[PDB]
Amino acid sequence: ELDQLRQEAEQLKNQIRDARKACADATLSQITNNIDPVGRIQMRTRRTLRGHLAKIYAMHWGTDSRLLVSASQDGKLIIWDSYTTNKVHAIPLRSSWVMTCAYAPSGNYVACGGLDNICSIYNLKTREGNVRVSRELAGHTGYLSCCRFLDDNQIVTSSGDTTCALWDIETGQQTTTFTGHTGDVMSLSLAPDTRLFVSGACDASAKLWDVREGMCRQTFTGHESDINAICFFPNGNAFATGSDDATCRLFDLRADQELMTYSHDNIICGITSVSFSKSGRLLLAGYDDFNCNVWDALKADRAGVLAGHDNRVSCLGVTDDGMAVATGSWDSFLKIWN
Amino acid sequence: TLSAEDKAAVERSKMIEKNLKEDGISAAKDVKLLLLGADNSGKSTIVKQMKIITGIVETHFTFKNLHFRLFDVGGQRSERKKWIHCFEDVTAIIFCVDLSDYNRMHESLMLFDSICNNKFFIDTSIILFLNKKDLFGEKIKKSPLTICFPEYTGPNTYEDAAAYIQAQFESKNRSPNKEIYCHMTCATDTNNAQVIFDAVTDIIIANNLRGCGLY
C-alpha cells in the first residue's frame, strides 16, 4: 500500500520541481547583473580579544553592539566589553564541551550548550554580584548546535537528534517540537520579526518554520553535502547558507527556489559561519582553510580577504548596527575588524 | 582618559584573567583520553579504581604524578564527524576490543579503520586493550577463529590467534607519526593503571621528540 503513497509523493514533488522551474523566468542572471560592483573592502585588525586557553567554538553579539559572549572548550564563558577590550564576567561551565552560545536581546541572559545535551541559561543582572545558573533545560537525545533568544523567557535550540525545540525558561519544558530534518540540525537563524526561523541539517535541507505554529512551510533543497551555517536577510524574505562543499548560496522565500550562488573553483574547505551586513549587501563567510572571505550577496565577487587566524574559524558575527564584525577561530583568540 | 569606574572595571578584568591563568595552569596537568569500542566491549571496567563524574560520561582517577580523565562517549548516536574535533587534543585514544564476541569483531575492526585514518586522529596514538582474554582462551577450543576471520593458517592456539588479531588491527594503521600500543589484559587484571601510565608517558615523550624535529 506504500507504493501508491510513494507514487503520489513523487508526483507532488515533480509538480513542485516543475513549478519552481516555470517560476524561474528572468532568473538570477541579468536581474542583479546590471548595477555597480561593491568594490574593494579591506578591514584592519582593530581588536584581538585574548583570554581563552582552548578552542573557541561559538560567539554571539549583544544587541547594544557593545558586549560579546564567547564560549569555548575550556569550560569558560567570557563576556567581553569590545570597546575597551575588556572582560565583564567569567562563568565557569559544568561541562566544558560547548558548541553554542547566545545573548538575550534585553542584555539580561546568556545561553550555552554542547555535548551534555543541556541548554543552560545564566542570569547576568542579579542582586548577588555573580552570574548564577537560572535554569538547566534538558530533554533532547542529542547535542545542541545553535540556540537563539526570542525574549527573556523563550529560547529555541537546534540539536543533532533530528529535532528542534522551543522552550520556556520558567518551567523548563518543550512547548513546541519541530519534527523533520532526518540528518543532524546544524544551524539556526531568526528573522527580524520573531515569527519565522530557518534551520539547516546534515541531510542537505534548509527548512523554514513558524514560531506560532509547529510545522514547516518551505523546504529549500540543492546542497550536495553537509550544512553548517545559516543567516536571514535584513528584509526578512531571504537567507544565506554555508555548507561543507565550499559553496555559499543565497535563497529566496517568495520564489521557493535558489538565487545566486557564490562558489569558487579552487576552494574546497567547508564553510563554518556566514553572516550578512546591515544592508544585506555584504556577506561574510567563514572558511575551514584558516580564512574568512567576504562576498557580495547580489553578484559573485571576492571583495576582500580577512586573514590572520592560526586555526579554523567556527564563529562569525556582525552587530545589529553593522559597525564591526567579530571573527573567532580555534587559536584561542577571536578578532574584531572594522 | 580613564574614569574611576573604568579603573575598577580594569581591576576586575585583571582579577578575572588572573583566575583564568590559574585555572589553566591547574588544568594543564591532566591527561585526557578517549575511550572507544563496540557495545559492551569492556569500556565500563577499564580501571577498577576510578571515580565517576546523558551525552557523554567522564571518569577520572589519579595515578602517581598525573591525573587521568576518560571520556566514554557512549550514547552519542549522532554523526561521528561533527563532534570529533572536540576530542582533537586528546593525548591518546584507548580502544577496547572484546575477543569473546565473534559477531561484533568486524564492527570493532570497522570502527578502528574509521578512527585510525581520520583527519583529526592522524597523530593521536592508540592504546589497544584486547580485553576478555580469559573466556576467549576458554572458548578458543570450540571456535577456531576462521569462522570470523578467514585467509590464515595456524595451530588454533591462543598465542597465534592473539597475534593474528593484533596484526589485523595494526594492518588498518596508515600513519608515519603514530604507534599503536597493544597490551592483552584480563577481566581480573588489577594492573591496568600502570599500563596506561607507561603508555601515556611514552606517548608524551614521543610527541615531544616529534615536535623538535626528531622521531
Epitope: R127, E128, G129 | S3, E5, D6, A9, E11
Partner: single-chain antibody, 230 residues
Framework: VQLVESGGGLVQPGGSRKLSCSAS????????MHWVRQAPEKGLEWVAY????????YYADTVKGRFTISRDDPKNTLFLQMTSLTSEDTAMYYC??????????????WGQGTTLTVSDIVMTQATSSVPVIPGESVSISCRSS???????????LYWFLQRPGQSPQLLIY???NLASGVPDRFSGSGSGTAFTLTISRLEAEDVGVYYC?????????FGAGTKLEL
C-alpha cells in the same frame, strides 16, 4: 543580602575604636566596599574604601594618616580601624557595597549605621525646606564644581533618598539610569554641572532628604540635602 555593622559607642577624646561590618547574602570578594559617615544633624561624607581583593585602598582628606580599612574575605568581614578619635568623628558610619563593570550600579546597598560618640569637587544643591505637595512635579536641582562628563560618554551623578530613620537608597545612577526596585515616577536628566531629578506624581514613602554624588574624581562629594515636607 543584608549588611550588619557592629561596634561603636563612647570613646575618650584621643582613644581608638575599630568598627567592623559583615555581609551575608552576596559574594563579598566581588564588591568594593565603602565607609560613609553621617553627622547627627548634617549630610553625608565619604570616609574609606577598599577594592575587590584589597587591590586599591583610598582614604579621605580627613581620613588619610589616621584611619585604616581592612577586609577579611574568607570570613566575609570588613574592618575600619580608627586612631586618634577627635570630636569631629561623632557620626553614624554606613557600610556601602559597590560593583564595577559595564552596566553596573555602584552604591546600590547600604547597611544600618553605627552611632559613634566621642565626648576637589564642591557640590551644593537647591533649597533645603521645599514645600512638597502630595502629587505634583518637583524638580530637585544639583550643582558641581566641574562638568562631570568623561570621554566614555558616561556622565556620572548619583541620586540618594534618605527616608526618616533609614539608610540611604540609590535611585538614579550614571545620569538617567533607574536603579532596580525604584518606581517609574523617578526620573533624572541634565548636562554638565546641571542636574535635576524630576519627580512627577509624588506619593507617600518619598519624604526625606535627597543627595547627590560625583564619581569621576574619586574623593567623593555629596550635596547638603533637599528635604521634602508634608
Amino acid at each position: 543580602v543584608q549588611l550588619v555593622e557592629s561596634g561603636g559607642g563612647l570613646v575618650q577624646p584621643g582613644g581608638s575604636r575599630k568598627l567592623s561590618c559583615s555581609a551575608s547574602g552576596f559574594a563579598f570578594s566581588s564588591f568594593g566596599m565603602h565607609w560613609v559617615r553621617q553627622a547627627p544633624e548634617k549630610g553625608l561624607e565619604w570616609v574609606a574604601y577598599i577594592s575587590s581583593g584589597s587591590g586599591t585602598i583610598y582614604y579621605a582628606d580627613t581620613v588619610k594618616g589616621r584611619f585604616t580599612i581592612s577586609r577579611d574575605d574568607p570570613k566575609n568581614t570588613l574592618f575600619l580601624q580608627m586612631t586618634s578619635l577627635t570630636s569631629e568623628d561623632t557620626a553614624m558610619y554606613y557600610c556601602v557595597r559597590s560593583i564595577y563593570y559595564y552596566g553596573s550600579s555602584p552604591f546600590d546597598f547600604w547597611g544600618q549605621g553605627t552611632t559613634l560618640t566621642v565626648s576637589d569637587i564642591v557640590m551644593t544643591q537647591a533649597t533645603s525646606s521645599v514645600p512638597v505637595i502630595p502629587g505634583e512635579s518637583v524638580s530637585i536641582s544639583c550643582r558641581s564644581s566641574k562638568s562631570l562628563l568623561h570621554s566614555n560618554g558616561n556622565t556620572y551623578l548619583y541620586w540618594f533618598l534618605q527616608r526618616p530613620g533609614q539608610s540611604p537608597q540609590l535611585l538614579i545612577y550614571r545620569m538617567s539610569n533607574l536603579a532596580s526596585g525604584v518606581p517609574d515616577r523617578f526620573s533624572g536628566s541634565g548636562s554638565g554641572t546641571a542636574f535635576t531629578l524630576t519627580i512627577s506624581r509624588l506619593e507617600a514613602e518619598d519624604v526625606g532628604v535627597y543627595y547627590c554624588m560625583q564619581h569621576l574624581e574619586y574623593p567623593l562629594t555629596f550635596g547638603a540635602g533637599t528635604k521634602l515636607e508634608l
